[PDB]
């Protein structure tokens, strides 16, 4: 019974690994868009000053 | 500030895990009440079968 429990735990672990891989390959566009919109308007404030 | 808010989120997740542990100990108390029927060796093995 502990063997089937640890097997279900390994299944949950690989599911969570696939999930974190998905959210890592999905969050990179958000992060790059954020930093691009940040740097593009900081220079705007600089040229405004 | 990001660190402290993420650690507060982690503490909330730990509180949720504590609630899950509370549910599990409730289930184990139910199992204790179930074994209270036949737990203390109610079916004693035969003495002189050998």
């Amino acid at each position: 019974n502990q063997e089937q429990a640890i097997a279900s735990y390994e299944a949950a672990k690989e599911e969570l690994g696939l999930k974190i891989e998905q959210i890592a390959q999905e969050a990179q566009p958000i992060k790059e868009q954020y930093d691009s919109t940040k740097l593009a308007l900081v220079e705007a404030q600089d040229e405004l000053q | 500030r990001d660190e402290v808010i993420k650690k507060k989120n982690q503490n909330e997740y730990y509180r949720g895990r504590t609630k899950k542990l509370q549910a599990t100990i409730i289930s184990t108390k139910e199992d204790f009440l179930r074994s209270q029927e036949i737990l203390a060796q109610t079916h004693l093995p035969e003495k002189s079968v050998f």
Binding site: - | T18, Q22, I25
Partner: protein, 53 residues
């Protein structure tokens, strides 16, 4: 529903408009502090129930 409506409470017969109201952060601060204290006391009660069981 009415262009000039007084406050529901008494002791103030003057009418109060939208521009008369101001955002006082102390009130919401106190309400959220009370909510945090309630959540903390609930967590404490749950932990005590964990200990006694």
């Amino acid at each position: 529903g009415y262009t000039t409506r007084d406050c529901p409470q008494a002791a103030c017969s003057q009418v109060v408009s939208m521009r008369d109201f101001v955002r006082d952060p102390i009130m919401e601060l106190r309400c959220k502090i009370a909510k945090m204290k309630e959540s903390q006391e609930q967590d404490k009660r749950s932990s005590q129930a964990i200990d006694v069981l």
